[PDB]
Amino acid sequence: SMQAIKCVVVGDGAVGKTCLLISYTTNAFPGEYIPTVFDNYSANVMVDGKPVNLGLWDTAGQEDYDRLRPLSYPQTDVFLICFSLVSPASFENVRAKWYPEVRHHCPHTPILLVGTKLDLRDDKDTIERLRDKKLAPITYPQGLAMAREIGSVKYLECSALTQRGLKTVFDEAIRAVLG
Numbered sequence: 001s002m003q004a005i006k007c008v009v010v011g012d013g014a015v016g017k018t019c020l021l022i023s024y025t026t027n028a029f030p031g032e033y034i035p036t037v038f039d040n041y042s043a044n045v046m047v048d049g050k051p052v053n054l055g056l057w058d059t060a061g062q063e064d065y066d067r068l069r070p071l072s073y074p075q076t077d078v079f080l081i082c083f084s085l086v087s088p089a090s091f092e093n094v095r096a097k098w099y100p101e102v103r104h105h106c107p108h109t110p111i112l113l114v115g116t117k118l119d120l121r122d123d124k125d126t127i128e129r130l131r132d133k134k135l136a137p138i139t140y141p142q143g144l145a146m147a148r149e150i151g152s153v154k155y156l157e158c159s160a161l162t163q164r165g166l167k168t169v170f171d172e173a174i175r176a177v178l179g
């Protein structure tokens with residue numbers, strides 16, 4: 001027994017959940033091949049001088065799985081609720097959909113709020129695209145405020161593509177369970 005930790009990742013379609021898991025576990029961002037299946041990834045992580053077995057559970061974010069997806073929730077040690085920093089709709093869904101759904105099935109499990117696609121937040125074409133819809137990328141203070149609102153233990157931002165902040169997401173996830 002390496003200590004085992006079950007981590008489940010949830011959030012809207014296209015927020016980057018699968019890329020996040022693959023980039024983390026393989027140290028490589030998927031190119032033109034992102035698994036469509038909702039797999040479980042097994043990673044090992046050193047925490048305070050001890051190896052931990054992190055099982056990472058990908059989920060489908062579409063409405064069609066609203067009855068099937070929660071069957072993966074039992075025995076979860078920590079949830080990651082993901083939204084894209086460059087999709088305000090995905091951010092609103094953290095409060096509207098994901099927080100309520102997780103808490104319906106798992107009242108006490110820690111939640112980390114994770115803002116993805118960090119590399120796009122200061123990307124000009126992305127800012128302009130959002131400005132056209134009277135919108136702007138989600139800022140760190142906004143994400144932090146959403147994290148408090150949903151009782152998250154931690155708010156993190158990362159990019160699966162550049163890997164900036166990626167390892168911290170899962171270190172903090174583990175520490176939320178273990179210390």
Ligand SMILES: Nc1nc2c(ncn2[C@@H]2O[C@H](COP(=O)(O)OP(=O)(O)O)[C@@H](O)[C@H]2O)c(=O)[nH]1
Binds near residue numbers: 012015
């Ligand atoms: N620029 C950027 N694109 C990303 C990142 N992570 C994922 N993507 C892209 O976002 C899209 C959705 O990613 P995916 O992992 O399939 O999202 P999922 O539906 O939540 O599983 C794909 O086109 C990815 O290439 C990131 O960190 N930066």
Ligand SMILES: [Cl-]
Binds near residue numbers: 012014059060061062
């Ligand atoms: Cl999805």
Ligand SMILES: [Cl-]
Binds near residue numbers: 144148152
């Ligand atoms: Cl917080």
Ligand SMILES: [Mg+2]
Binds near residue numbers: 017018019035058059
């Ligand atoms: Mg996926």
